[PDB]
Amino acid sequence: NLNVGLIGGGFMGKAHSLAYAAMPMFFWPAPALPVRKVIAEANPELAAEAARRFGFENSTSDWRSIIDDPDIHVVDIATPNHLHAEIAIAAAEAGKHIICEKPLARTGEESKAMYDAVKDKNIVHMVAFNYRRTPAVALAKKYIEEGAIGRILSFRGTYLQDWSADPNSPLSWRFQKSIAGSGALGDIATHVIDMARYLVGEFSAVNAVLSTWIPERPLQRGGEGPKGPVDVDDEVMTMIRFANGAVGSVEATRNAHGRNNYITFEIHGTEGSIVFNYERRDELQVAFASDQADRRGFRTVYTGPAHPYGEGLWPIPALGIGYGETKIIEAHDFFKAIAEGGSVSPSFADGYQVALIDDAIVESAAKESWVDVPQISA
Amino acid sequence: MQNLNVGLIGGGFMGKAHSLAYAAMPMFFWPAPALPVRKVIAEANPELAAEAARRFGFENSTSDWRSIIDDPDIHVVDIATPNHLHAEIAIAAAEAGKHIICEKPLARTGEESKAMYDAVKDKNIVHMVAFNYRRTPAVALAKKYIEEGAIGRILSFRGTYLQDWSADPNSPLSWRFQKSIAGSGALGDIATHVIDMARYLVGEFSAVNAVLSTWIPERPLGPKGPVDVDDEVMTMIRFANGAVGSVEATRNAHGRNNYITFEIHGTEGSIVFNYERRDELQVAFASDQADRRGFRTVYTGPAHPYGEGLWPIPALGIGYGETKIIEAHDFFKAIAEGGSVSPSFADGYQVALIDDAIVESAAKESWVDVPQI
Amino acid sequence: MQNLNVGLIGGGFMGKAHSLAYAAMPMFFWPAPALPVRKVIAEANPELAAEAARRFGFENSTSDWRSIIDDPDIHVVDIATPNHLHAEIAIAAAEAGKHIICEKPLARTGEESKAMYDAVKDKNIVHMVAFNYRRTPAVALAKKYIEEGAIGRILSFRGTYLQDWSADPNSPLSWRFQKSIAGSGALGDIATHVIDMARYLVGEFSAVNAVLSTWIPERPLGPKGPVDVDDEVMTMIRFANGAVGSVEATRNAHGRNNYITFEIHGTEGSIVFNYERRDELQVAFASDQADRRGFRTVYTGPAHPYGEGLWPIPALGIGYGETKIIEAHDFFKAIAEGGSVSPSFADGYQVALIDDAIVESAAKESWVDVPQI
Amino acid sequence: MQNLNVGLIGGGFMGKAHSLAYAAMPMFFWPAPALPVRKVIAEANPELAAEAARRFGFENSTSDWRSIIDDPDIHVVDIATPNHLHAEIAIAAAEAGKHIICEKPLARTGEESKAMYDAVKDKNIVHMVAFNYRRTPAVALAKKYIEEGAIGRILSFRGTYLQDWSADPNSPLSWRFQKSIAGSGALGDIATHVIDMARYLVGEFSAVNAVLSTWIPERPLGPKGPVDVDDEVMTMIRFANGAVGSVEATRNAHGRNNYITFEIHGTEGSIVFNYERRDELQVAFASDQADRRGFRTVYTGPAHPYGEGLWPIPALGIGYGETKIIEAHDFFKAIAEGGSVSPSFADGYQVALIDDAIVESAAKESWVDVPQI
Numbered sequence A: 001n002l003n004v005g006l007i008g009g010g011f012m013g014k015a016h017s018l019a020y021a022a023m024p025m026f027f028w029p030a031p032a033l034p035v036r037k038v039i040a041e042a043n044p045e046l047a048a049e050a051a052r053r054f055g056f057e058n059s060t061s062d063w064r065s066i067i068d069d070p071d072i073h074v075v076d077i078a079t080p081n082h083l084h085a086e087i088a089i090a091a092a093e094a095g096k097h098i099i100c101e102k103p104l105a106r107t108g109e110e111s112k113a114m115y116d117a118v119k120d121k122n123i124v125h126m127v128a129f130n131y132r133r134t135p136a137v138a139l140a141k142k143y144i145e146e147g148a149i150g151r152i153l154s155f156r157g158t159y160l161q162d163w164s165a166d167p168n169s170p171l172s173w174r175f176q177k178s179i180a181g182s183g184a185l186g187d188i189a190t191h192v193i194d195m196a197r198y199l200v201g202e203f204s205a206v207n208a209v210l211s212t213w214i215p216e217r218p219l220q221r222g223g224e225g226p227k228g229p230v231d232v233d234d235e236v237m238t239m240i241r242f243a244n245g246a247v248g249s250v251e252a253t254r255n256a257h258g259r260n261n262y263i264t265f266e267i268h269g270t271e272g273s274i275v276f277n278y279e280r281r282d283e284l285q286v287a288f289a290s291d292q293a294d295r296r297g298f299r300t301v302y303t304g305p306a307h308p309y310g311e312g313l314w315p316i317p318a319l320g321i322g323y324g325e326t327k328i329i330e331a332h333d334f335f336k337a338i339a340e341g342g343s344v345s346p347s348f349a350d351g352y353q354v355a356l357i358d359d360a361i362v363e364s365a366a367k368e369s370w371v372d373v374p375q376i377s378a
Numbered sequence B, C, D: 001m002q003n004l005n006v007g008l009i010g011g012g013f014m015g016k017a018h019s020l021a022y023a024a025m026p027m028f029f030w031p032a033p034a035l036p037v038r039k040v041i042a043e044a045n046p047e048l049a050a051e052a053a054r055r056f057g058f059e060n061s062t063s064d065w066r067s068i069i070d071d072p073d074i075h076v077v078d079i080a081t082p083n084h085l086h087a088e089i090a091i092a093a094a095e096a097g098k099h100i101i102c103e104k105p106l107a108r109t110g111e112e113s114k115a116m117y118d119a120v121k122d123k124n125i126v127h128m129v130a131f132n133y134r135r136t137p138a139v140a141l142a143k144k145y146i147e148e149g150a151i152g153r154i155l156s157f158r159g160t161y162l163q164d165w166s167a168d169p170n171s172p173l174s175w176r177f178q179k180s181i182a183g184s185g186a187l188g189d190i191a192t193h194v195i196d197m198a199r200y201l202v203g204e205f206s207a208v209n210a211v212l213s214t215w216i217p218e219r220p221l222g223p224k225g226p227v228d229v230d231d232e233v234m235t236m237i238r239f240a241n242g243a244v245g246s247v248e249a250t251r252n253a254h255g256r257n258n259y260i261t262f263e264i265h266g267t268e269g270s271i272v273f274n275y276e277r278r279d280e281l282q283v284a285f286a287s288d289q290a291d292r293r294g295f296r297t298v299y300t301g302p303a304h305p306y307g308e309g310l311w312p313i314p315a316l317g318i319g320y321g322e323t324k325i326i327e328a329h330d331f332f333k334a335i336a337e338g339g340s341v342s343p344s345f346a347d348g349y350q351v352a353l354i355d356d357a358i359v360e361s362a363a364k365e366s367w368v369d370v371p372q373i
């Protein structure tokens, strides 16, 4: 039994709480049993209502009381980006295992403080880049590590969304630099960057453009009310030189009508190619050069028992993977590392590396030039 | 929020999906209609049961399902056993005044299904058959468009359920291949999902005309035993409202994993669904300007049926679990409100009568009228 | 390389596609089996014929097709008229020893189709029925995979041809909606293409069981006339080799434009084709390693059947024209080599017997065995 | 109706596609703006030339293209040679007062391209560069939507041209891999097509920032000559109208055959195009009701741009040739009407300047402003 203190029970609250409720039913025997012990929220009534909805034993309106609670094994940080650092540093000092939502923090420097706080402790630390644990993405990693597409030449990744494509969508914390740190870059590009690091390798250099299409939004009517500035990017595109000599690019936007949760990649290798589209996340597309010339092309592979993580999921391909299975796989690996005194990827080290890439992107965009990405060891 | 005590019978594949639905439903749909309590799970022996209770988070286990029926604390009996026990268990649970959700097919034959229906038809317990796929948000969305008149009158329906998990002859002779236990093969096991969908979206069947096929007549248990059910079924349909259609299901379609689909042609539009891409509904409106007319791919989210209880954006991703969660939500809403739910044992029994008429039709090679109730 | 003088009868829609094939075939398949010469075009009146000749690039026009039959320098007669003139023209052409390509359906009925077959069967002429879609390179590729055993033995076939050009009841009556001219509706006009494909890929039909529907029974000529043909056909099929299948065609599927498709299940793999994306063939091989198994999207080009005569890279793009070019190539090659071509009038006539059996089946609501030729 | 004598120079791949367009264009677009006469074809030697004339239906053949330029009765010169002869031939044709269509890229460099523009800009001749993919009906439909305001103001554009025909390093060192003949590799050969599409749909390029890659730096011809061009290009783009975007082209993407695509994001909708499925345009309108928004798959036909000249229903099927036919139609219409055509040598030259800016950008690793013609 590992006791979880969840901090924040907003748009993501449902997903985390599901992972903890469900993970043992999927991956059994379970290394440990997550217990939804206590949830913190911004005020006591909120916290109590969240605790009822998500099935937590206890509620608090002061997250510090979770840190000081010696019966709490795991702190799950699901607040806006401005509290990630302070909470994680307090939990690390109290010897807690930590899972933290992305982006790790607002900036590279702030993410550095979080990494520095966990680097030397005997705790499992994880950043919530859940999409790399889509079974189709794990499958792409398997094909690549096997050599089945040869050496990687080129990588394309997108994260295209449209939930704020209407300028009357309100000025939430995601549009305020002081809370979020960045816009599309921090909130969604980081997921793609993580996939790139996972599947291709480390970034050597970036060259980017940041765009804001909608500079003002209604404060939280038809947006006739008072308005505030958007001082973050709506959109980012960046070219990439990988340390291993592959090239690529990443594009993310909040302003692509028709695109809902369109995290995709295309990878070209010397002996084949892989395509993935999270809107059809059950599928991975793979083209092998070795196929006979008259029957050569992308195969649509549906993930199931035969594919990574399949032993813990559904008994046939296409029974259907949702967002929740990715969080379950995430929790499985997290609790497994804890139970075995091991560690998981992506960790705060990966979180910090992504934050350094983001800083380099921002700097590249500002100077209109190639910027070298520092590795976390510098 | 009242607690509703669930006794689950069966801890295999559906046991897990059902258990997830009970653990997750209030998280999803809040405030919840009622709070499910995983109170007792029954399994075939004490060690399995005990193991299952720990896996699925049930307060108690038992190796005798009758212990659940006789427990006055139990509000809900959830039948997730193979098809041969559905009837006994449901009839006992009804006689004890418990709400019932039963896996599909309702029972092995129409006659057996009739007994289950008769045991509930004069009561006001909530009774449900688990045709969960009609509660895919995309399918609910299709129902919405249809009921709105957005595709006009329905002319024609095509439904499939194509699978391949047993397309290898070396796949062994499980209960699903033995008539005595299953009642039928593809027909009972998967075509019923599609028949339900047709009843939900189009309306009642009037007549059927079918062909049943068995491609792999024996399988390993070393020694082998015979397959005495269908591997595949196809049937033409005359709907009571004058529409026409067909349904095809198979276990022998390489490349097809969980390919439950439909295509509907209305006088003012068409709708296409593919469960292997379940987040999508395809809809073509005749009313589109002539230079921008065609199927639009609609991803389900907050704006679509059940969207308030699901994920905050379209394509964050619906899997199998969400269908079972929505099923549980509705079942519990019926119980908390003293209402009924669709599909009920009435629906389950109507489907069993459609299956018998398909079998009869195939044997006689003629159209068979479907008995109504 | 001989010149072969073509006399084309009819200059409507198919006149254009036919004329392109004669103009283009040697550009594609070089050295060409022979050089088509667009010698004379017949149309319904002098002005129409002369205009057709200018547009389609024919040396001569006439308003009297018989003058083409009587011309000793015409080698090929190409029948592109409505269905009611196919038989008199083909029979006259056959009596004059001309090679003949005839549009589908071969004629209005089995009986009428039989008279055309009988007129050619004992002559040393090349006779062809223009089921061009089987010569989509993707469909030829499907045949190659099947012939090689690469999907094993065929269990099951599904074929469609869904259209919507007359889905609006305000679309006017044409000969296509008149039994006396067309012989049948969707059945003759489009399901024949699917039936041909089934015969090509799977084999001969043993029996059929069908339903014919008419959805829009009158159309504007304010005056209206009757539609006395089917808008829609569905049929189950028993194939002589023991496979089963079904075909469905309709004029009344909003969003479906030229949706000729098939899905074939074999013991070792599956093939799926969709003509709206004709460049593609989908194939699933059971032999793929278990973690990399499913449908491959194969784009046709140089490596695939007919690829030497087409574009130098896959997906440079096949349209309707290329199908008629390949058709013309094979036709002229047969003439040059003193051979036969498939599908011939024998094939045309078999399809007309399949159509007759489908119509009889729907009338009687029973299985009807398909006569062999 | 004027008959215009065409002198075609080159009988390779584009020679054939061009010939097809001249044979077919009047059949498609009738009454035609003018009738092309395939008068003379030039090839590298008399044997090739005469065989090309027999194959492509040309009346005369020559081994010397200058005798086409010097022939007073040739009205149109069509340049379908490799990139090294474009400028010489075009400048000669311009001076002889001929109308000119020239294959892409316009020439090997900015300066060569300039001399071609300078030679035609002040003459009363029609000049055209053969960026045929912008006349895919789907791309013309995209243009229509954009110019109507149906997707609002354009924010962002993504374009690709992914191929794999030389992904194998044993594929030989043809002219396309030799800088002194081609000028550049993927950039000039295929990125230019996407750069044209971007200019047509979005607007002029302001600046580029690029990376060029060579993956296979040597090829067979025992000895291996260097590949001294790019295999792949990627570039970011600032558009003069304030939109942003990127283009990526490669010869080294296994599974990608002729994958010229774009995605455009406007303030009120999005458009997506894939030439491997060229019959389709995908469009998402923000104006759709919240429960039925998404990309519509629109199949091009009579209702869409150029539809009057093409096939009578959507998805009868557009191939490569129809793009060349539309190109020829508009070229001949400009000549008949004393107009100009788009894209002209002005456009060809502007694309060559963009290519040079990309090359400069890659070498300097910095943003380069695109010079205006």
Ligand SMILES: OC[C@@]1(O)OC[C@H](O)[C@@H](O)[C@@H]1O
Residues within 6 Å of the ligand: A174, A187, A188
């Ligand atoms: O705001 C966009 C968002 O909710 O989109 C879905 C992603 O999974 C999540 O991390 C991200 O914050």
Ligand SMILES: OC[C@@]1(O)OC[C@H](O)[C@@H](O)[C@@H]1O
Residues within 6 Å of the ligand: B013, B176, B189, B190
């Ligand atoms: O046997 C196949 C099966 O498990 O496939 C998945 C279906 O959801 C289920 O009802 C069915 O029994």
Ligand SMILES: OC[C@@]1(O)OC[C@H](O)[C@@H](O)[C@@H]1O
Residues within 6 Å of the ligand: C104, C176, C189, C190
């Ligand atoms: O009328 C439908 C039709 O034109 O559709 C297109 C087919 O190619 C043709 O044979 C058929 O007659």
Ligand SMILES: OC[C@@]1(O)OC[C@H](O)[C@@H](O)[C@@H]1O
Residues within 6 Å of the ligand: D176, D189, D190
């Ligand atoms: O070399 C590749 C190529 O042939 O691919 C097809 C394009 O249409 C053409 O312009 C281009 O040169």
